[PDB]
Ligand binder design. Structure first.
Ligand SMILES: [Ca+2]
Ligand SMILES: [Ca+2]
Ligand SMILES: [Ca+2]
Ligand SMILES: [Ca+2]
Ligand SMILES: [Ca+2]
Ligand SMILES: [Zn+2]
Ligand SMILES: [Zn+2]
Lengths: 373, 373
């Protein structure tokens, strides 16, 4: 075929053996920079390292057009979740790459990086004509898309592109994603001895009553909410005067997320006030939602590339975020390609070899389709 | 007049400055033993020190009759709550003894001990006739009446007596105290990503809903219940699969405490099961309740002693336990005398000097009244 399977596997295995836990990207980043320079790209850094939760700058690597056709970008993230120091990957007879059980594999997202490096090597050695391609390697994706948020957008020059970073089968494309917001609550009551409970106001009882009347779980077909953490109270014989709650909400409609966050806020505040306490609520947007139209070129090209390789060509809506959630806010239409990694963020993480081969073949195919528009 | 007020004050100050945080009674215990022996008492020790939460044995100190009249016992506890290392008491012009604000005072319960020692010294030096009196000095009262629970009851020989350890004005007598039970619940759900909440079952939602269904606070006129601790969940983006609740219940009716604890147990178990989780509920009796009939000799002698000293002579019901709650289970009618200590278990704890004088005078009067019967 086109891609070198043996080389792609070796690249992937090399990459997972470079320690890059999120916020500690300073080892992997110079190595990736030098690899993309070695492949003939002009590699530029932004100033993301200045952020105190990030260990190196983002990389924006540009390959000149050798044809005019559309300007493409591709993105993967160089960081992994914890624990991912000294990953010892094992290729098995079942056709899956595993960790040894002591770490994550870091297929999320070094499969995406291995796929990008293999494709450039294939393009070089076969002189495949192509348009302009940007390879955007981010830091801190696993700390809440922080590299993407600190990205110098003037370094980008693209009509559309692809985040190689969806939890879906290879050939499935994520065409929309939700807005996510964090909602935290501090519920204050009044301390008393537990024998004289009329002298106090229990923040545990207020928080429990609030939660019991709150729209939570699958709030509707396109909206979710979850209380992740509930902590409060020091002793059985004391009326609890403080509870801390940490929650989230997600929706694919911006008006529904607004209503849901206001709802949670108001339920906490008015339940606490009714029972003689008070609620301090604070909110933070993690990322904004998007939906790319089904007839946009970026979608149809993704689908054609899947069809050409005998894959589903399905388009789905994700339950969460990626760097494409942020890059979409720059006005560059972006969809998220299935990588086919499994059990990510756990020490059982694994990568099917056939999926790595197809992903690499798909990214090549996308570049060729864009090159013939 | 009869109690030596300065000597009483000096004895109190001496005792508070000997560290006896609960479980670390090993230093104060032999110091107290020598004081009781030097005042002419036969002192016996049990084997409470073998208990791994207790640092010394209880002391049972017996004073033979110099008359036949009823056999009395008096009890105080030698331990204090934390923080009570390096207590630096201050006697102020407003008529109160304070700490320096970095520790508790330990008026609870060294006011009781001081009162006892002074009364013994007045009896000795004035040759006041008396019946048999036992002075029962416990350890671990502040760890849940643990020394009283380890007490060798065959060392006791009394018709009735008094725990000098109530949060009430001097001349007020506690004639009843409730049953307290601890109830703890581990609520288990099922983990899932917060974007797909139907795949999981939130233990936070279950635990909150259970609490909203439950009778809590002032359950009725003589029954209380409190959720003191509520802890669960690790992250906003994960459906929480575990919550630990720690609760209590109290009642002056031993059947209503059982009904309440069954009610709480049943609501946890049925709510968990309904919503697809489970509830593990464990119960422990901290201490049993009692109520001494108001016409009993022990109550009438406490009230008479109070009236003789110009004090209210009220009888109340307490909100909590004491060593008297345990000693009553041995069949020795016991009521709890108001000590007049204030803001106990806090670094603002204080002792009115006038209350200390009246308490020592009251204990002396009770011994005299018993000696006439
Ligand atoms: Ca930094
Ligand atoms: Ca990830
Ligand atoms: Ca679709
Ligand atoms: Ca011991
Ligand atoms: Ca106490
Ligand atoms: Zn990823
Ligand atoms: Zn006490």
């Amino acid at each position: 075929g086109m891609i070198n399977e043996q080389r792609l596997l070796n690249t992937f295995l090399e990459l997972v053996q470079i320690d890059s836990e999120t916020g500690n990207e300073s080892t992997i980043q110079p190595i990736l920079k030098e690899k993309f320079i070695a492949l003939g790209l002009d590699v530029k850094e932004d100033e993301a390292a200045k952020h105190p939760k990030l260990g190196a700058n983002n990389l924006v690597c540009t390959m000149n057009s050798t044809i005019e056709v559309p300007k493409l970008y591709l993105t993967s993230h160089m960081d992994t979740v914890v624990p991912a120091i000294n990953v010892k990957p094992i290729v098995k007879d079942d056709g899956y790459i595993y960790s040894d059980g002591t770490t994550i594999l870091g297929a999320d997202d070094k499969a995406g990086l291995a796929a990008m490096l293999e494709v450039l090597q294939v393009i070089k050695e076969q002189q495949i004509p192509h348009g302009q391609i940007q390879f955007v390697i981010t830091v801190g994706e696993e700390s809440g898309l922080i590299g993407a948020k600190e990205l110098n957008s003037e370094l980008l020059d693209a009509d559309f592109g692809y985040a190689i970073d969806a939890s879906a089968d290879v050939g499935t494309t994520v065409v929309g994603a939700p807005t996510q917001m964090l909602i935290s609550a501090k519920i204050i009551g009044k301390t008393a001895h537990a024998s004289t409970p009329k002298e106090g106001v229990s923040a545990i009882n207020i928080a429990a009553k609030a939660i019991s009347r709150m729209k939570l779980g699958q709030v509707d077909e396109i909206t979710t909410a979850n209380i992740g953490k509930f902590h409060g109270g020091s002793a059985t014989n004391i009326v609890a005067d403080e509870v801390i709650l940490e929650a989230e909400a997600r929706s694919h409609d911006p008006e529904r997320i607004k209503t849901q966050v206001k709802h949670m806020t108001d339920v906490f505040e008015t339940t606490a006030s009714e029972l003689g306490g008070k609620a301090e609520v604070t909110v933070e947007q993690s990322y904004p939602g998007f939906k790319i139209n089904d007839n946009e070129a970026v979608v149809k090209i993704a689908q054609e590339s899947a069809r050409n390789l005998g894959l589903s060509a399905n388009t789905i809506i994700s339950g969460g975020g990626s760097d494409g959630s942020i890059i979409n806010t720059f006005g560059i239409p972006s969809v998220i390609l299935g990588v086919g990694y499994e059990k990510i963020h756990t020490t059982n993480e694994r990568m099917p070899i056939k999926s790595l081969n197809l992903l690499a073949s798909q990214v090549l195919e996308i570049i060729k389709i864009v090159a013939r528009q």
